[PDB]
Amino acid sequence: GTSKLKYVLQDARFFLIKSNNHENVSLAKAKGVWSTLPVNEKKLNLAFRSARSVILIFSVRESGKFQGFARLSSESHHPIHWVLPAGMSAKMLGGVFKIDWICRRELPFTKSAHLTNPWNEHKPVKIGRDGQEIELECGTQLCLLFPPDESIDLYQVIHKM
Ligand SMILES: O=C1CC(CN(Cc2ccccc2)C2CC2)=NC(=O)N1
């Protein structure tokens, strides 16, 4: 069903998080961690303190899809073998956020064409810079479009709220 998912998403905040490649999403899915540049680190840390749930919705650049979504379980904290763009050092990252995956299934952008994000001029929700906040209603409907991930049990995540 969808009821535990809706409960986790109640009064949540949502952020569009880009990845430079699939490998970093794979690492994040395996290890339950993510890192960012300091600008988005500050934004996500403020959000983590503000809301019962902060949801990261991931999209690998140029993939035309979202690769899943996860809930922050921690503020950032200060090596993980991330695959970084040429010229970027690990020292340019902020701290590491712990995350609990809610859905590891993909959703193509074609399936979210009917959702617009008020915090990005009501452009389609797939459009946004890395770190763009997605308004509650749009973000909830976007998460509900993903195929159910029957491998995940949200019992444990509800307890962290
Ligand atoms: O475009 C991105 C990609 C990305 C993946 N990073 C490396 C990186 C961080 C910031 C910019 C470019 C690459 C691995 C998880 C530590 N994390 C983001 O937060 N935004």
PDB file of C-alpha atoms and ligand atoms in Angstrom:
ATOM      1  CA  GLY A   1       0.000   0.000   0.000  1.00  0.00           C
ATOM      2  CA  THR A   2       0.831   3.703   0.120  1.00  0.00           C
ATOM      3  CA  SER A   3      -0.226   4.698   3.651  1.00  0.00           C
ATOM      4  CA  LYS A   4       3.133   4.431   5.437  1.00  0.00           C
ATOM      5  CA  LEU A   5       4.716   6.344   2.546  1.00  0.00           C
ATOM      6  CA  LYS A   6       2.121   9.101   2.848  1.00  0.00           C
ATOM      7  CA  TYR A   7       2.801   9.235   6.586  1.00  0.00           C
ATOM      8  CA  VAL A   8       6.547   9.675   6.039  1.00  0.00           C
ATOM      9  CA  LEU A   9       5.840  12.437   3.502  1.00  0.00           C
ATOM     10  CA  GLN A  10       3.417  14.309   5.768  1.00  0.00           C
ATOM     11  CA  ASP A  11       4.659  17.871   6.234  1.00  0.00           C
ATOM     12  CA  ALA A  12       7.939  16.912   4.543  1.00  0.00           C
ATOM     13  CA  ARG A  13      10.201  19.184   2.560  1.00  0.00           C
ATOM     14  CA  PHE A  14      11.527  18.021  -0.800  1.00  0.00           C
ATOM     15  CA  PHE A  15      14.667  18.852  -2.786  1.00  0.00           C
ATOM     16  CA  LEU A  16      15.735  17.996  -6.316  1.00  0.00           C
ATOM     17  CA  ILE A  17      19.264  16.565  -6.015  1.00  0.00           C
ATOM     18  CA  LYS A  18      21.400  16.068  -9.124  1.00  0.00           C
ATOM     19  CA  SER A  19      24.162  13.534  -9.578  1.00  0.00           C
ATOM     20  CA  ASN A  20      27.022  13.877 -12.034  1.00  0.00           C
ATOM     21  CA  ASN A  21      26.882  10.140 -12.802  1.00  0.00           C
ATOM     22  CA  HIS A  22      25.155   6.866 -11.993  1.00  0.00           C
ATOM     23  CA  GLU A  23      28.083   5.585  -9.925  1.00  0.00           C
ATOM     24  CA  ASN A  24      27.503   8.112  -7.155  1.00  0.00           C
ATOM     25  CA  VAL A  25      23.819   7.185  -6.945  1.00  0.00           C
ATOM     26  CA  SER A  26      24.836   3.517  -6.794  1.00  0.00           C
ATOM     27  CA  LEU A  27      27.231   4.256  -3.927  1.00  0.00           C
ATOM     28  CA  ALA A  28      24.529   6.294  -2.171  1.00  0.00           C
ATOM     29  CA  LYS A  29      22.009   3.456  -2.570  1.00  0.00           C
ATOM     30  CA  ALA A  30      24.508   0.930  -1.169  1.00  0.00           C
ATOM     31  CA  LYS A  31      25.904   2.986   1.731  1.00  0.00           C
ATOM     32  CA  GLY A  32      23.036   5.304   2.696  1.00  0.00           C
ATOM     33  CA  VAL A  33      25.111   8.500   2.357  1.00  0.00           C
ATOM     34  CA  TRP A  34      25.332  11.623   0.209  1.00  0.00           C
ATOM     35  CA  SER A  35      27.522  14.704  -0.006  1.00  0.00           C
ATOM     36  CA  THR A  36      27.215  18.073  -1.713  1.00  0.00           C
ATOM     37  CA  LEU A  37      28.958  21.366  -2.232  1.00  0.00           C
ATOM     38  CA  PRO A  38      28.828  23.669   0.821  1.00  0.00           C
ATOM     39  CA  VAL A  39      26.013  25.828  -0.620  1.00  0.00           C
ATOM     40  CA  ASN A  40      23.538  22.957  -0.667  1.00  0.00           C
ATOM     41  CA  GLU A  41      24.950  21.518   2.547  1.00  0.00           C
ATOM     42  CA  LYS A  42      23.859  24.663   4.401  1.00  0.00           C
ATOM     43  CA  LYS A  43      20.419  24.573   2.784  1.00  0.00           C
ATOM     44  CA  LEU A  44      19.827  20.916   3.638  1.00  0.00           C
ATOM     45  CA  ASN A  45      21.078  21.321   7.220  1.00  0.00           C
ATOM     46  CA  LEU A  46      18.616  24.177   7.758  1.00  0.00           C
ATOM     47  CA  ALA A  47      15.862  22.020   6.266  1.00  0.00           C
ATOM     48  CA  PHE A  48      16.729  18.988   8.401  1.00  0.00           C
ATOM     49  CA  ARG A  49      16.125  21.052  11.559  1.00  0.00           C
ATOM     50  CA  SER A  50      12.886  22.537  10.179  1.00  0.00           C
ATOM     51  CA  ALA A  51      10.824  19.536   9.159  1.00  0.00           C
ATOM     52  CA  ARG A  52       9.704  16.109  10.253  1.00  0.00           C
ATOM     53  CA  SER A  53      11.130  14.673   7.000  1.00  0.00           C
ATOM     54  CA  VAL A  54      13.492  16.042   4.367  1.00  0.00           C
ATOM     55  CA  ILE A  55      13.232  14.118   1.103  1.00  0.00           C
ATOM     56  CA  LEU A  56      15.969  14.074  -1.547  1.00  0.00           C
ATOM     57  CA  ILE A  57      14.728  13.162  -5.037  1.00  0.00           C
ATOM     58  CA  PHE A  58      17.690  12.129  -7.191  1.00  0.00           C
ATOM     59  CA  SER A  59      18.276  12.688 -10.897  1.00  0.00           C
ATOM     60  CA  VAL A  60      21.448  11.756 -12.773  1.00  0.00           C
ATOM     61  CA  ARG A  61      22.242  14.593 -15.177  1.00  0.00           C
ATOM     62  CA  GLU A  62      21.158  13.920 -18.784  1.00  0.00           C
ATOM     63  CA  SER A  63      19.466  10.649 -17.794  1.00  0.00           C
ATOM     64  CA  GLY A  64      15.902  11.871 -18.376  1.00  0.00           C
ATOM     65  CA  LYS A  65      14.803  10.128 -15.174  1.00  0.00           C
ATOM     66  CA  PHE A  66      14.742  10.243 -11.402  1.00  0.00           C
ATOM     67  CA  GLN A  67      16.577   7.301  -9.822  1.00  0.00           C
ATOM     68  CA  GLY A  68      14.675   7.243  -6.511  1.00  0.00           C
ATOM     69  CA  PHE A  69      14.234   9.190  -3.301  1.00  0.00           C
ATOM     70  CA  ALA A  70      15.492   9.067   0.270  1.00  0.00           C
ATOM     71  CA  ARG A  71      14.947  10.772   3.616  1.00  0.00           C
ATOM     72  CA  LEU A  72      17.724  12.583   5.467  1.00  0.00           C
ATOM     73  CA  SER A  73      18.466  10.850   8.745  1.00  0.00           C
ATOM     74  CA  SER A  74      21.179  13.294   9.869  1.00  0.00           C
ATOM     75  CA  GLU A  75      22.684  16.702   9.396  1.00  0.00           C
ATOM     76  CA  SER A  76      25.994  16.703   7.556  1.00  0.00           C
ATOM     77  CA  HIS A  77      29.047  15.388   9.417  1.00  0.00           C
ATOM     78  CA  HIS A  78      32.781  15.308   8.699  1.00  0.00           C
ATOM     79  CA  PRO A  79      36.758   9.024   2.780  1.00  0.00           C
ATOM     80  CA  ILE A  80      33.980   7.712   0.523  1.00  0.00           C
ATOM     81  CA  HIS A  81      35.189   6.732  -2.949  1.00  0.00           C
ATOM     82  CA  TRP A  82      32.920   9.087  -4.873  1.00  0.00           C
ATOM     83  CA  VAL A  83      33.549   9.500  -8.600  1.00  0.00           C
ATOM     84  CA  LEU A  84      34.121  13.244  -8.880  1.00  0.00           C
ATOM     85  CA  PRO A  85      34.282  15.464 -11.978  1.00  0.00           C
ATOM     86  CA  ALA A  86      37.729  16.226 -13.357  1.00  0.00           C
ATOM     87  CA  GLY A  87      39.376  19.043 -11.417  1.00  0.00           C
ATOM     88  CA  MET A  88      37.190  18.623  -8.315  1.00  0.00           C
ATOM     89  CA  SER A  89      38.865  17.433  -5.117  1.00  0.00           C
ATOM     90  CA  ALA A  90      37.151  15.644  -2.251  1.00  0.00           C
ATOM     91  CA  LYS A  91      38.117  18.642  -0.091  1.00  0.00           C
ATOM     92  CA  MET A  92      35.599  20.764  -2.036  1.00  0.00           C
ATOM     93  CA  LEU A  93      32.689  18.739  -0.648  1.00  0.00           C
ATOM     94  CA  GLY A  94      30.864  19.545   2.543  1.00  0.00           C
ATOM     95  CA  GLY A  95      30.122  16.882   5.112  1.00  0.00           C
ATOM     96  CA  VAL A  96      28.307  13.590   4.608  1.00  0.00           C
ATOM     97  CA  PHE A  97      24.559  13.242   5.125  1.00  0.00           C
ATOM     98  CA  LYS A  98      23.138   9.914   6.207  1.00  0.00           C
ATOM     99  CA  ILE A  99      20.032   8.947   4.218  1.00  0.00           C
ATOM    100  CA  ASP A 100      17.391   6.214   4.374  1.00  0.00           C
ATOM    101  CA  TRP A 101      16.149   5.138   0.972  1.00  0.00           C
ATOM    102  CA  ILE A 102      12.383   5.215   0.511  1.00  0.00           C
ATOM    103  CA  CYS A 103      12.353   4.135  -3.124  1.00  0.00           C
ATOM    104  CA  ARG A 104      15.238   2.805  -5.217  1.00  0.00           C
ATOM    105  CA  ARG A 105      13.100   2.513  -8.382  1.00  0.00           C
ATOM    106  CA  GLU A 106      13.365   4.934 -11.289  1.00  0.00           C
ATOM    107  CA  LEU A 107      10.718   7.263 -12.739  1.00  0.00           C
ATOM    108  CA  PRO A 108      11.107   8.735 -16.249  1.00  0.00           C
ATOM    109  CA  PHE A 109      10.524  12.468 -16.637  1.00  0.00           C
ATOM    110  CA  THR A 110       7.783  11.695 -19.174  1.00  0.00           C
ATOM    111  CA  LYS A 111       5.638  10.440 -16.286  1.00  0.00           C
ATOM    112  CA  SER A 112       5.909  13.681 -14.266  1.00  0.00           C
ATOM    113  CA  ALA A 113       5.024  16.061 -17.115  1.00  0.00           C
ATOM    114  CA  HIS A 114       1.759  16.990 -15.375  1.00  0.00           C
ATOM    115  CA  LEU A 115       3.479  18.241 -12.190  1.00  0.00           C
ATOM    116  CA  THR A 116       4.714  21.816 -11.832  1.00  0.00           C
ATOM    117  CA  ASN A 117       6.882  23.240  -9.063  1.00  0.00           C
ATOM    118  CA  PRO A 118       5.670  26.572  -7.584  1.00  0.00           C
ATOM    119  CA  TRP A 119       9.163  27.290  -6.227  1.00  0.00           C
ATOM    120  CA  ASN A 120      10.594  27.205  -9.756  1.00  0.00           C
ATOM    121  CA  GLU A 121       8.039  29.382 -11.598  1.00  0.00           C
ATOM    122  CA  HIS A 122       5.639  26.431 -12.021  1.00  0.00           C
ATOM    123  CA  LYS A 123       8.024  24.854 -14.523  1.00  0.00           C
ATOM    124  CA  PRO A 124       7.753  21.045 -14.807  1.00  0.00           C
ATOM    125  CA  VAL A 125       9.157  19.470 -11.641  1.00  0.00           C
ATOM    126  CA  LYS A 126      11.975  17.772 -13.567  1.00  0.00           C
ATOM    127  CA  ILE A 127      13.424  21.261 -14.173  1.00  0.00           C
ATOM    128  CA  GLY A 128      15.594  22.818 -11.495  1.00  0.00           C
ATOM    129  CA  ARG A 129      19.130  23.507 -10.422  1.00  0.00           C
ATOM    130  CA  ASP A 130      20.733  21.059  -8.023  1.00  0.00           C
ATOM    131  CA  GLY A 131      19.189  21.732  -4.632  1.00  0.00           C
ATOM    132  CA  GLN A 132      15.963  23.303  -5.922  1.00  0.00           C
ATOM    133  CA  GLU A 133      13.231  22.952  -3.310  1.00  0.00           C
ATOM    134  CA  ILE A 134       9.997  21.331  -4.491  1.00  0.00           C
ATOM    135  CA  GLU A 135       6.805  22.614  -2.860  1.00  0.00           C
ATOM    136  CA  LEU A 136       4.963  20.142  -0.564  1.00  0.00           C
ATOM    137  CA  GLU A 137       2.028  19.208  -2.808  1.00  0.00           C
ATOM    138  CA  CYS A 138       4.102  18.822  -5.968  1.00  0.00           C
ATOM    139  CA  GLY A 139       6.782  16.875  -4.111  1.00  0.00           C
ATOM    140  CA  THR A 140       4.237  14.541  -2.522  1.00  0.00           C
ATOM    141  CA  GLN A 141       2.588  13.810  -5.855  1.00  0.00           C
ATOM    142  CA  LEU A 142       5.972  13.260  -7.492  1.00  0.00           C
ATOM    143  CA  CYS A 143       6.996  10.723  -4.858  1.00  0.00           C
ATOM    144  CA  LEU A 144       3.648   8.938  -5.202  1.00  0.00           C
ATOM    145  CA  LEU A 145       4.237   8.490  -8.949  1.00  0.00           C
ATOM    146  CA  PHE A 146       7.271   6.272  -8.414  1.00  0.00           C
ATOM    147  CA  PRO A 147       6.685   2.526  -8.694  1.00  0.00           C
ATOM    148  CA  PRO A 148       6.247   1.029  -5.219  1.00  0.00           C
ATOM    149  CA  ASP A 149       9.507  -0.384  -3.849  1.00  0.00           C
ATOM    150  CA  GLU A 150       8.387  -3.588  -2.138  1.00  0.00           C
ATOM    151  CA  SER A 151      11.923  -4.259  -0.885  1.00  0.00           C
ATOM    152  CA  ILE A 152      11.725  -1.372   1.620  1.00  0.00           C
ATOM    153  CA  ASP A 153       9.878  -1.419   4.955  1.00  0.00           C
ATOM    154  CA  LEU A 154       9.074   2.108   6.178  1.00  0.00           C
ATOM    155  CA  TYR A 155       8.440   0.939   9.773  1.00  0.00           C
ATOM    156  CA  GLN A 156      12.035   1.809  10.726  1.00  0.00           C
ATOM    157  CA  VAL A 157      11.934   5.273   9.114  1.00  0.00           C
ATOM    158  CA  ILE A 158       8.692   6.227  10.867  1.00  0.00           C
ATOM    159  CA  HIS A 159      10.414   5.562  14.194  1.00  0.00           C
ATOM    160  CA  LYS A 160      13.178   8.051  13.342  1.00  0.00           C
ATOM    161  CA  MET A 161      10.616  10.841  12.940  1.00  0.00           C
TER     162      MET A 161
HETATM  163  O1  LIG B   1      25.515  17.527  -8.870  1.00  0.00           O
HETATM  164  C1  LIG B   1      25.706  17.006  -7.743  1.00  0.00           C
HETATM  165  C2  LIG B   1      26.558  15.761  -7.754  1.00  0.00           C
HETATM  166  C3  LIG B   1      26.817  15.101  -6.521  1.00  0.00           C
HETATM  167  C4  LIG B   1      27.654  13.879  -6.338  1.00  0.00           C
HETATM  168  N1  LIG B   1      28.771  14.069  -5.355  1.00  0.00           N
HETATM  169  C5  LIG B   1      29.982  14.753  -5.946  1.00  0.00           C
HETATM  170  C6  LIG B   1      29.683  16.181  -6.451  1.00  0.00           C
HETATM  171  C7  LIG B   1      29.147  17.143  -5.552  1.00  0.00           C
HETATM  172  C8  LIG B   1      28.836  18.459  -5.985  1.00  0.00           C
HETATM  173  C9  LIG B   1      29.052  18.832  -7.334  1.00  0.00           C
HETATM  174  C10 LIG B   1      29.580  17.880  -8.247  1.00  0.00           C
HETATM  175  C11 LIG B   1      29.889  16.561  -7.808  1.00  0.00           C
HETATM  176  C12 LIG B   1      29.065  12.891  -4.558  1.00  0.00           C
HETATM  177  C13 LIG B   1      27.989  12.505  -3.442  1.00  0.00           C
HETATM  178  C14 LIG B   1      29.347  13.179  -3.020  1.00  0.00           C
HETATM  179  N2  LIG B   1      26.278  15.670  -5.387  1.00  0.00           N
HETATM  180  C15 LIG B   1      25.473  16.850  -5.491  1.00  0.00           C
HETATM  181  O2  LIG B   1      25.038  17.239  -4.376  1.00  0.00           O
HETATM  182  N3  LIG B   1      25.204  17.494  -6.626  1.00  0.00           N
END
